[PDB]
Amino acid sequence: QESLSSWIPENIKKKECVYFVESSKLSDAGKVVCQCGYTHEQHLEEATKPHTFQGTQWDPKKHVQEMPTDAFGDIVFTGLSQKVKKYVRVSQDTPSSVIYHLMTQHWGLDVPNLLISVTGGAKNFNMKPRLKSIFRRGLVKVAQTTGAWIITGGSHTGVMKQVGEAVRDFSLSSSYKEGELITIGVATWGTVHRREGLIHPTGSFPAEYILDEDGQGNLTCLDSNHSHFILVDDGTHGQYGVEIPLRTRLEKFISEQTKERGGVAIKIPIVCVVLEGGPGTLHTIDNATTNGTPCVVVEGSGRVADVIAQVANLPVSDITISLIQQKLSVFFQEMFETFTESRIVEWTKKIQDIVRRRQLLTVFREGKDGQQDVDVAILQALLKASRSQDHFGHENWDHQLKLAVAWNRVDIARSEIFMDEWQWKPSDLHPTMTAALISNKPEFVKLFLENGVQLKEFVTWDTLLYLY
């Protein structure tokens, strides 16, 4: 534990302003605010010096500086639980390999088989109870049985609340391997309510953190159910959205590492699942599915999800601006008057570009058709997206099988991989069978024997020497 407290301030930085440029707009009882206005008469905890120049409009490229980090360590919520939760404050721009090396080595997390990036509306909302129970059960099922990470904003409001609720339901169950559900939370350090008790250098391994809903202003407080916390910091008190340019880079860097087990090696797949959402969530959905990541929307309980849920089956160019205008007016109906006509053209362009790619986007269709559960929908969407990826030959069919055997579950492989339309020959199963044999999964051995692999033809001399 001492090696971690040595290692962390040597590698990771944080930002702070050094220059006092008093801003025009007085804050709510915070009239002394020097365009960050953090904690002084100045936006400073350094020497309030003229800095040899009265540079007005204090540019963040010109003003703020990086320093070693004083806020890391471990946390525990005062009076809500007894477990401990790791947390760290990072700068605006650290290379993602540093954070990945931190999360694997020092916090002690294995390389995950799947990365689920749930997103949605920040404001609170509600839904039907049957949909709520189905969604919670399916999410905890897939994240427990797969060995996956769940990455989201770690605040107490909105979608980020509800997913944490599902995690707490698993703490109600806690059948076996209670540490399997690992959820990280990426949040902005500037907008954390009672954060002043956390700042203690050289390790704050017991850190009691109280919380109070409605005892806070525009800034917010953390959620309590998340398991790890990463707080990006810019040096600004009242600013939102600093977490987004690091979260995408971290997701794209994690989605290129190769996990190798047995003989096989894969690249970690990534899926994004969306809920009720808002205006910017649609832009985030489009920006994600441009890069080739799949996306699963949830039919029902959506200010912006149900729009895509209804428009999903109409063809391209059937969508008109009047159609989206009446849809926006019936579904939003509160900001629907506030929306201009210069942005619904943008939203038609975005929705046409989303529903054009019928492969990656997937509606849930709750209850009606194909509604087996949530987990099989996510896995079928991920496999369908991996299937339509381009390939020179039939190595994609090998890749889907390696993905299905990297996850533990076997119902998917006998359900749809071995349905038809491959014409595989049994000599093309000898690698993954080896990987099914080392990691002690007898179900895949029985499945491979039912598709007729010959054990007398399989065990060569060199395969035996490799097995020993």
Partner: protein
Amino acid sequence: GDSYHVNARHLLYPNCPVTRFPVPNEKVPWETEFLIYDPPFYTAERKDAAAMDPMGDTLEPLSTIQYNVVDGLRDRRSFHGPYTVQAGLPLNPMGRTGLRGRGSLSCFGPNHTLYPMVTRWRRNEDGAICRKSIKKMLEVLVVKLPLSEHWALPGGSREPGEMLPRKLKRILRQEHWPSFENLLKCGMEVYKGYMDDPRNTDNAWIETVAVSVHFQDQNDVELNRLNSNLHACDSGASIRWQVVDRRIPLYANHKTLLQKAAAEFGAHY
């Protein structure tokens, strides 16, 4: 859901063992034909006395004051408009009430009263404004009378003009500082006009003025001196500040003023 005075149409007039006529939602206004309407004429026993109008038996020609005009010390004129007169008696401008007579009210037509409301933001321990899901919180100062079983707004009958705050707050505010808050009583208005109340006959109804003095800064200024003008314990049980909510435990028709008051600032509901 047509907005009719349902508290005035409510049966069993307060503190007087009589009933009113059944007036359904169709036959409420005067324009509608309603043949079987037989309102019993009822006035208070102390409605034939002094100061208040002696017109409890106004079939006699004693009813001779000026209607929809300021008739001396009784400014018998409605804020809503010129009320119609039948047999020397005013008709209710909103509809039928099912009970004729003076009731327990003072004079005929409207009876002008004044309701001030003191509004301030709700601060946290640090000094920032608390918030709902979107909107903010408002705090109002409210008086509990010892024999009312309802918190009520600190406003009384406007029998004087500028001492109607003092007529509301002789028991509440002060006598010396009461002139100082009367200087502060010039603020912003919310609503004026006819007000629903269970003491409304077809002849005597209630009209009011809703002024809204507001405190923006929650440190000092008027707020410290208004707290320093507390000479509270005179003839009341208790006064205290109170956070606004739909489930605010109050008198019934006072909440209709607050639902119109929060729109002028953007609070929650």
